Amino acid sequence: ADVQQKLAELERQSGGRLGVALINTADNSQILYRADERFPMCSTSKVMAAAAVLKQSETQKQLLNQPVEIKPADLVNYNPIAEKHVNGTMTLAELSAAALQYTDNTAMNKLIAQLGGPGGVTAFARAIGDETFRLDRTEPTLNTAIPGDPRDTTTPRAMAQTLRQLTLGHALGETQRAQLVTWLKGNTTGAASIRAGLPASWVVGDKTGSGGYGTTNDIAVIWPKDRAPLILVTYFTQPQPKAESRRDVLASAAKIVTDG
Amino acid sequence: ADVQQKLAELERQSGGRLGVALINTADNSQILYRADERFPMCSTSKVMAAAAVLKQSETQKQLLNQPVEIKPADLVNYNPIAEKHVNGTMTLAELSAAALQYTDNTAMNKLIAQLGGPGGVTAFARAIGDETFRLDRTEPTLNTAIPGDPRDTTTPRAMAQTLRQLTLGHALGETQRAQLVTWLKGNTTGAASIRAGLPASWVVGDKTGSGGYGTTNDIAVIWPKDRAPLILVTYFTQPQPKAESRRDVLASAAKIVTDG
Ligand SMILES: *C(=O)/C=C/NCC(=O)CCO
Numbered sequence: 001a002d003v004q005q006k007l008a009e010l011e012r013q014s015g016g017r018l019g020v021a022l023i024n025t026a027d028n029s030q031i032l033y034r035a036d037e038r039f040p041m042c043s044t045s046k047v048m049a050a051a052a053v054l055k056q057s058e059t060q061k062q063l064l065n066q067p068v069e070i071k072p073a074d075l076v077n078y079n080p081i082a083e084k085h086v087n088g089t090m091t092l093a094e095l096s097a098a099a100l101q102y103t104d105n106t107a108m109n110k111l112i113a114q115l116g117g118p119g120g121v122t123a124f125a126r127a128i129g130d131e132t133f134r135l136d137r138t139e140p141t142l143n144t145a146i147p148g149d150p151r152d153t154t155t156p157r158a159m160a161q162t163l164r165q166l167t168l169g170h171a172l173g174e175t176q177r178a179q180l181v182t183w184l185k186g187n188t189t190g191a192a193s194i195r196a197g198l199p200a201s202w203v204v205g206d207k208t209g210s211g212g213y214g215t216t217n218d219i220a221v222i223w224p225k226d227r228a229p230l231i232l233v234t235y236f237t238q239p240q241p242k243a244e245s246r247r248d249v250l251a252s253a254a255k256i257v258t259d260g
Numbered sequence: 261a262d263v264q265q266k267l268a269e270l271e272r273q274s275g276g277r278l279g280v281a282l283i284n285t286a287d288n289s290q291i292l293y294r295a296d297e298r299f300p301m302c303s304t305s306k307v308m309a310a311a312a313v314l315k316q317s318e319t320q321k322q323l324l325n326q327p328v329e330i331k332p333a334d335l336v337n338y339n340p341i342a343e344k345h346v347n348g349t350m351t352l353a354e355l356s357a358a359a360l361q362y363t364d365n366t367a368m369n370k371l372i373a374q375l376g377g378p379g380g381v382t383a384f385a386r387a388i389g390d391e392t393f394r395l396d397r398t399e400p401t402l403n404t405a406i407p408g409d410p411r412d413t414t415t416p417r418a419m420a421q422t423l424r425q426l427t428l429g430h431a432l433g434e435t436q437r438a439q440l441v442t443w444l445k446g447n448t449t450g451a452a453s454i455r456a457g458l459p460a461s462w463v464v465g466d467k468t469g470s471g472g473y474g475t476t477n478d479i480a481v482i483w484p485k486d487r488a489p490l491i492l493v494t495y496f497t498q499p500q501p502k503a504e505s506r507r508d509v510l511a512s513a514a515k516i517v518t519d520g
């Protein structure tokens with residue numbers, strides 16, 4: 001079962017462009033497909049923002065408890081948690097969990113503002129060795145996902161390497177690494193994406209993304225039953241602005257790269 | 261009408277037996293398909309067990325914080341949370357969250373044992389006016405899903421009415437209703453099931469289930485964009501003992517009954 005042929009056969013029937021990077025931590029092996037091409041991150045960028053706030057919390061003792069005001073003018077296009085707290089507050093822990101687990105776009109804008117704007121998220125990426133990631137705009141326009149636009153993009157290779165360092169390596173302090181893994185494992189939005197291509201016994205923490213041009217993304221840490229963890233990035237984007245999501249493509253890509 | 265044609269077409273093309281009950285709380289209207297037939301509940305029974313322990317906590321006010329020993333011998337077939345706490349303890353709140361949001365089977369068995377066995381779960385159903393629900397076994401045998409077997413079954417109509425009373429009505433005290441809704445909204449397993457058939461802006465709390473005979477279930481409380489909440493039960497089972505899961509059939513059924 002040649003994995004490269006199978007990923008090409010999936011892509012050719014998909015109506016889009018597929019990017020895959022798998023890191024198997026049992027042996028540091030990698031499976032790469034368009035892994036050095038740039039894809040729009042969409043909501044998968046929320047992992048870098050939440051991680052940068054966790055890094056801040058290593059030096060600002062009570063940071064995750066700090067209340068942040070939510071005003072009516074802050075609401076954007078998808079605010080399932082933040083709309084409950086308008087003319088009130090959410091803590092930076094609650095905004096981190098809302099952004100990662102509920103993909104709340106207002107919550108992500110508060111994380112970006114806590115970092116000094118999109119460039120502060122990029123700066124944290126650079127501080128942990130990621131030279132590829134770039135965040136350029138706030139929610140919701142960071143999800144436009146226009147083909148060819150470098151704004152708000154990374155590569156599968158870079159994002160897999162970064163996600164390994166954040167969740168399994170030492171980019172964060174041990175308490176903060178554990179909190180990041182707890183949050184990803186509590187994701188509510190992932191079951192139809194990478195997880196749908198894996199056996200029922202395997203444990204996943206992930207962050208999805210979706211945006212214009214049918215962009216459909218997932219980045220995951222995987223704890224397979226009786227195996228060392230995997231990191232898997234699956235990015236997908238389509239040529240028409242109003243294309244439909246294709247989470248099924250991501251599930252198929254995950255099955256192909258884990259079957260062996 | 262068209263909804264009945266679409267559900268019968270989904271069912272026929274799937275090869276299985278589909279049960280649907282939708283309650284629209286805007287006007288108490290319903291959409292029903294095989295809504296009085298019995299289906300194996302599988303892990304959707306965890307909602308009744310967690311609700312029964314919430315009910316106990318209305319009078320045993322410290323019960324959710326009670327430590328429960330997790331022994332190696334207590335682990336069954338899918339225990340993603342309990343395996344991290346073997347030779348230690350989890351509280352009944354932690355076990356309720358694990359059962360509901362991670363579908364942990366070891367956690368469900370501790371809820372059942374807290375209630376004095378499967379009959380305690382049934383007794384709570386009867387106390388809140390559900391005369392249909394029955395729990396007969398523990399995990400994992402409650403998931404055998406043998407055709408014709410009435411054990412560990414309910415009807416879509418009965419489960420939709422119960423889930424309405426638990427999440428939107430007064431089967432529970434207000435704090436316990438809110439706690440059940442917070443748990444369901446934090447489900448990690450549901451994005452391929454009812455949630456996949458609904459517009460992205462709608463808010464869902466749900467509990468999935470899976471078992472023998474390709475049994476694939478979901479029960480959900482839904483807060484549609486700008487509308488009164490819905491309750492939706494989708495139950496699905498297949499003729500072959502080893503049939504694969506079909507979460508796409510539940511997503512298809514949800515789209516059909518909410519499109520109009
Ligand atoms: C992540 O890519 C974006 C997450 N939230 C926005 C939506 O879910 C838009 C649905 O219309």
Ligand SMILES: *C(=O)/C=C/NCC(=O)CCO
Pocket residue numbers: 200201302303304337338363364365403468469470471
């Ligand atoms: C609910 O129906 C069952 C939950 N636990 C079993 C699994 O979902 C995974 C089996 O490996």
